[PDB]
Amino acid sequence: AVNQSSSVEVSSESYETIFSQRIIRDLQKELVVGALFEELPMSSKILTML
């Protein structure tokens, strides 16, 4: 961390730096089939019609 290069004063070891807890986000698919098709509510397990 503070190494590479540590010369000539304080060398110390490694983890000697502030870290950031913030996240970021890359790519995504845009959702075009999960919200485009009509919902049919039903109270059973199978629905039948002629």
Next chain:
Amino acid sequence: AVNQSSSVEVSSESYETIFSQRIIRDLQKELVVGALFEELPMSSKILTML
């Protein structure tokens, strides 16, 4: 020259001409990368994030 032609007799030596004290140049370049992306300020040698 300055010694030719003597008008009519009396003439002066070389380096008798007044000039302009200023500095200038015809062109510079084009420059754009230094004012494009944001700056990220950092006190430490390095920074980590998840």
